[PDB]
Amino acid sequence: VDNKFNKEQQNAFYEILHLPNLNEEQRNAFIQSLKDDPSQSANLLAEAKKLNDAQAPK
């Protein structure tokens, strides 16, 4: 997206939107973190995905 939203950040962004059973506050938090943080967020991406899994298939 912008001059920030590059490598891991965008892959993760996409994968994040791609979550089929995670959409609330977690989605929000992850968008926010994707927006402020460069590379730590990928670990956190794995977290968003596991959250998706936590509500639905863990």
Swiss-Prot record:
It comes from Staphylococcus aureus. It comes from the Bacteria. Immunoglobulin-binding region B repeats lie at residues 1-58. Important immunodiagnostic reagent because of its ability to bind the Fab and Fc fragments of a wide range of mammalian immunoglobulins. The lineage of its organism: Bacteria, Bacillati, Bacillota, Bacilli, Bacillales. Plays a role in the inhibition of the host innate and adaptive immune responses. Possesses five immunoglobulin-binding domains that capture both the fragment crystallizable region (Fc region) and the Fab region (part of Ig that identifies antigen) of immunoglobulins. In turn, Staphylococcus aureus is protected from phagocytic killing via inhibition of Ig Fc region. In addition, the host elicited B-cell response is prevented due to a decrease of antibody-secreting cell proliferation that enter the bone marrow, thereby decreasing long-term antibody production. Belongs to the immunoglobulin-binding protein SpA family. It is found in: Secreted, Cell wall. The gene is spa. Interacts with host TNFRSF1A; this interaction leads to the stimulation of both surface expression and shedding of TNFRSF1A. Transmembrane segments: none annotated. Each of the immunoglobulin-binding region repeats can bind the Fc region of an immunoglobulin. This is Immunoglobulin G-binding protein A.
